Design a protein around this ligand. Structure first.
Ligand SMILES: c1ccc2[nH]c([C@H]3CCNC3)nc2c1
Ligand SMILES: c1ccc2[nH]c([C@H]3CCNC3)nc2c1
Ligand SMILES: c1ccc2[nH]c([C@H]3CCNC3)nc2c1
Ligand SMILES: c1ccc2[nH]c([C@H]3CCNC3)nc2c1
Length: 337
């Protein structure tokens, strides 16, 4: 429909304007009080802005560890993409800056915690609930792929639950703008498509594979391919073999056989009809795509928390000091940050 085509055209216009002239140096560390570590070359911390009282989540990266871990390009991708995107299900970057030792990305604080903890607490999500979360990922990937972006890190730990029970996707450390194919070995083993494992050039089809893994994990309670050694996981991934729990609906099994298709040229999301083969699949027949986008659907649950600074839905980590040098490190490498 022209309304969808027009929405995506305007989304690409606005993304490219920020992509081509990125914001830089929009706050400083002294503006924020440190509250707590929320997750941990990098860590995410709850902070409070000292003039407004607003809470934020601040991702901190040690430049010397980024260089040593060969993540320079990836770190630059992450910040340049995050400052340029805008979508209801993506965590919003509010500020960014750097100092002699570190890089800082200050994002909205999403207080309901990671999907992963709620999934492991309940055990599994029933199909209607898994479908609600999957619909948000389908819309988010339609948006990102239309901007020539590949996300490359879908998993429950990267999906935060907001105050209305909707998903906010976080962690763009492997996201990349790609016009044709890309080649980097990256991602999380359980979620990798066969073409990444086999060292091929690959494209946005890897995100649709990962959506297949995520839907399976939400509805079963565990991912389809697992083992103690990564090489064993990879052997299962490339084999073409998946076993489904008997409680899966027939429609769910059908969708997952088409997402978990080892031949990328046959995989749903990567065919002539693109995302519409997924949106029109029978498993999504009850989904009101516009109502989801507009946040008009009652969520599966609302996270329990006491206020905008409550951290109860996140776990406890050792509170470590940040590194502080009197000399600038890696200045040339991070000039554009
Ligand atoms: C998160 C982590 C570390 C932080 N240190 C600070 C201030 C303290 C004095 N100058 C910077 N805000 C932080 C927020
Ligand atoms: C419409 C368009 C873009 C939007 N960005 C957001 C923020 C709030 C939750 N995370 C991103 N809401 C939007 C609504
Ligand atoms: C905002 C609030 C909390 C957040 N936790 C994270 C990462 C940590 C690893 N998986 C999610 N990003 C956040 C953004
Ligand atoms: C807190 C205390 C001691 C610290 N030393 C350092 C850097 C300086 C040279 N290499 C270590 N950051 C610190 C933060």
């Amino acid at each position: 429909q022209e309304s969808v085509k027009e929405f995506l055209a305007k989304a690409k216009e606005e993304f490219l304007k920020k992509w081509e002239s990125p914001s830089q140096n929009t706050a400083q560390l002294d503006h924020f009080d440190r509250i707590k570590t929320l997750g941990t070359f990098g860590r995410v911390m709850l902070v409070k802005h000292k003039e407004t009282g607003n809470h934020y989540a601040m991702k901190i990266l040690d430049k010397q560890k980024v260089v040593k871990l060969k993540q320079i390009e990836h770190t630059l991708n992450e910040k340049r993409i995050l400052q340029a995107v805008n979508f209801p299900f993506l965590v919003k970057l509010e500020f960014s800056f750097k100092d002699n030792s570190n890089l800082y990305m200050v994002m909205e604080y999403v207080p309901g915690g990671e999907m992963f903890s709620h999934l492991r607490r309940i055990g599994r999500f029933s199909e209607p609930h898994a479908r609600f979360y999957a619909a948000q990922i389908v819309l988010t990937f339609e948006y990102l792929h239309s901007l020539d972006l590949i996300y490359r890190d879908l998993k429950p730990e990267n999906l935060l639950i907001d105050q209305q029970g909707y998903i906010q996707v976080t962690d763009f450390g492997f996201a990349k703008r790609v016009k044709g194919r890309t080649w980097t070995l990256c991602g999380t083993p359980e979620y990798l498509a066969p073409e990444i494992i086999l060292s091929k050039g690959y494209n946005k089809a890897v995100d649709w594979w990962a959506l297949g893994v995520l839907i399976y994990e939400m509805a079963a309670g565990y991912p389809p391919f697992f083992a103690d050694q990564p090489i064993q996981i990879y052997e299962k991934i490339v084999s073409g073999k998946v076993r489904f729990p008997s409680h899966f609906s027939s429609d769910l099994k059908d969708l997952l056989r088409n997402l978990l298709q080892v031949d990328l040229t046959k995989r749903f999301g990567n065919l002539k009809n693109g995302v519409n083969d997924i949106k029109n699949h029978k498993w999504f027949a009850t989904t009101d795509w516009i109502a989801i986008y507009q946040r008009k659907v009652e969520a599966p649950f609302i996270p329990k928390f006491k206020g905008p600074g409550d951290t109860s839905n996140f776990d406890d980590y050792e509170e470590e000091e940040i590194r502080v040098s009197i000399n600038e490190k890696c200045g040339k490498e991070f000039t554009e940050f």
